[model samples]
Target: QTDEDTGPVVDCTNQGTNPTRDTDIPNPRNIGDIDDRSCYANYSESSILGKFWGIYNITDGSNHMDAPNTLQPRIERSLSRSQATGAGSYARFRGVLRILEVGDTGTFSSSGSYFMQAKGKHTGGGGSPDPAICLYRAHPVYGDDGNGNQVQVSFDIWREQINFRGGSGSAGRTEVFLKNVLKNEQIDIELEVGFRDDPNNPGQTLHYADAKIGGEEFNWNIPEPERGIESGIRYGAYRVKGGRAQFRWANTSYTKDEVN
Candidate 1:
């Protein structure tokens, strides 16, 4: 860690006060010169400080409201894939999603944890996607000073499934809590469908896509995590099983509880 200098200054006045209205006062145009300006004192340096890293998903399909009749079967197949995983299936499905930003500061502690929440409607998809949020710490391949090789971690949350076939839409919420993460470590947050062929099978086709962050209008390509310096900021809520789910940031907040 590094530190910078800061404080106050002083001024001086004349010793003799004359009765005359005209007095020759010496005007120092640049008394303090470079050090006098407040901008010069507002210096910032690269340090592993506690920073809040956030990302919002603005994908187009992420909140799709309608699915054509031709695509209904495919959508239903995706929903079935998610449901067969059981309750924990949607709750524990993890994936290698991308991160948006890099080199930014994040707040996490050995005793601190993060929470996720969301809301939306599951239109005419299948039986409703088994939506769940998950977080992951990234392990980069190569970089300079190992800083580029930083280990990243993420936080996520989503909704579960419901039976919404040839009827109206429905919405729901999914919230998760991840405790005790290391500070300054890279993190990735993702919304996904939990489904697999079998416990030993790794080639399962999960129908959900990665959430995007800040950028133009809300679309699938807006919040491209791979383009950001850090990953883990999402926008907009989603619905599972034809219901909407929204995130509520109530009394939950993350802080630096300890230094590693």
Candidate 2:
């Protein structure tokens, strides 16, 4: 059950191991002048979005290989504890993105350039909570597909590849999807997360994610849904290890509902 390639191979994002965040540095600075925050009703104490609705996250310079140097610049909309665990909860994150930059994919093995996410309460033993699910952008890296012929598995803005990352209790995994995204092109995206009946287990439920990119769909479920404890939503730039990753968003919106 703890293998990355196990279970449906579709929802076991954390089965192998959680990816490392190597590109983070301590004492990050927020350039408030760069963002517009005018869409959300509330914000976390650490969010620079303040009363405005816009958001942003950054990691600059180098020397970020330390554990505590987690470089995740994000804003979260948390659900009440009861709302997350009792029955089930769901959150929808919608926005239009124009990526200016997504950093470099250093080493190309375990690095990532993250842009959006779903959260689970008390995950990772209360250290830095790993996203129950996330989306990533990286420079193009080629490898064989399920058949045999080689294809790009990772992508930068230029390659127009977008990666889906995460699962219920798994460390999270990445799968690449392609689009003809050009520089500064307005791309519409919607990420919805919630619970659904587990087809494999008759009486069980699973954490599920539905991703819509330019109207295309990519759906998956978490094998260990209960491990998440609760649920939340997150969006902004994050990197495992890379250079300056810059991105912009507009017409952003969020909604939450409970299935109690």
Candidate 3:
């Protein structure tokens, strides 16, 4: 039951904006050209094209809608392309996400919704089983705000009530950044990824991701072996199971610069 359009649709795919540009490419298939500035994967529905991706004509600026999903309805930033493994080369993805209420997938072992993610490109040979280096995800689990009342919480990747997840080399960790997320609340998010010199090692480098959710900072190193591989950023509703997921992005932009 898709194809439910209830708003003025704006095709900003070609609007030549800044930081994050738009494209005029049409009829983009999964992993195909989304905008002149980005590449997207839309597997939310198999029978219909563009059933999961759109930009609505809201009073605000370019507000994108990525609704309902399974294998992700997302866009990958291509303005700066993928970042090279230089200590300074990096890309920053920023957007405000308002995740509407979604169906609970019961177990917290899996993510019901993913808002932002930065990972490595397998363009380099197999250094790991997955290309995902860091992910900002939300689970279906409800938590308490100290008063024993239910509040939306982030995913539990490591049995912790944390929303930030990462894995590089042979180790992985999760951290609690935004402990309690309110449904339909605006979440300003930023993800920066690049390579940096290992603090302990003199001539060694490591891939790393620094995230800012709601103005809170959370940093992670991509660990060993995962270094040298090119990295990139992807945002929007990447995955959803059990129920419908909706995310609105305004003031969305992507900037590329040296981390130094």
Candidate 4:
């Protein structure tokens, strides 16, 4: 999260097929370990706000031609070994996953831009998510959040038509949009999913969320939440359709203390 920030869809993330612990980087699941057709990623050891956090890289195997058309969230960092909690923790999975073959109906028409997520208990079960924070190129699948609550957010990042609600949309709701944000490109993205404090403001909002591309920061004017951060801090990519795109983050990232 420093000004020295570099690369696109680069998460300094790692991967592994079988993880005895969180620091597993299995070649088969390694996005950047292989080729360009494959995804590359990295996870943060200490995100700007978490004590423990990380990311993963999963795929449908072959290229984007055949179906099975699925992927998984792999991790380079884990909380299992941490042994405790902090004021808050979150991992921003930033990186680029090529939408090699935008699924059906075309890459920008129908099913072009869509998204879905997961929600689970506050503590336990690693940080990422159940199905892993999935980005679909086409087709879709999903389940319920750990709290027995069902949720999903679908809209092309470029469309800027999605609503990132903090508390079940019961209270805090933030409307986000940035022009020409979508439509065939590497789709540079910076999504923060942790209790990160304002790197500039001393005690503003630990639940702060603001995105930018190349350096253009967009505004998310939602007031602070009572318990509103990417609630559930869940994971996965549920039912998605139509030509889509995917980007993976790969760069050795790290976490930070409660107070930076």
- Number of the top candidate by TM-score? 3
* Model 1 Cα lDDT, one tens digit per residue, 1-260: 31212122111112212222122133311111111111111111122334221111111112122343211100000111222322123311121222321111232211111122221223334323422223222111222445564432332212222222212233432222222222223333333322223334454322222332211111121111111111122221221111111111111121111111
Ranking by lDDT, best first?
Answer: 3, 2, 4, 1
Ranking 1 against 3 by lDDT, winner: 3
User: Which sections of candidate 1 miss by over 4 Å?
Assistant: 1-121, 124-174, 188-194, 197-260
Using TM-score as the measure, what is the rank order of every candidate, best first?
A: 3, 2, 4, 1
Q: Which stretches of candidate 4 lie over 4 Å from their true place?
A: 1-25, 28-90, 100-110, 113-175, 179-184, 196-206, 219-224, 229-238, 243-260
Could you estimate the TM-score for every candidate?
A: 0.19, 0.56, 0.59, 0.38
> How many steric overlaps are in each model, in order?
52, 14, 4, 44
As a whole number from 0 to 100, the lDDT of residue 207 in candidate 3 is 72
Clash count, predicted structure 2: 14
* Tens-place lDDT digits, model 4, residues 1-260: 32111233332224322222233334322222221222233322223221222232323231221134443222222211111122355434343322222223433333333222222133223332331222222221223548886322222343122233223221322223443322223344454434544566776554433444545665343233223323222121212232223322333232322322
What are the per-residue Cα lDDT tens digits for candidate 3 across 204-223?
A: 77777788777877776664
Stretches of candidate 2 off by over 4 Å are 1-59, 62-82, 85-88, 110-112, 122-132, 138-180, 199-202
Per-residue lDDT over 1-260 for candidate 2, one digit per residue giving the tens place of the 0 to 100 score: 11011122121112212133222223323211111111111121122222222323333332122334443332222322224643356777787755444445456543445556555554445324454444544443456768998544434532111122233222335455444454445567777777766778787777766777667776756445666565555566555344444445556666777775
Which candidate number has the best lDDT?
Answer: 3
Candidate 3 has a TM-score of: 0.59
Worst 10 residues of 4 by lDDT: 76-85
The residue ranges of model 3 lying beyond 4 angstroms of the native Cα positions read 1-80, 122-124, 127-130, 141-178, 258-260
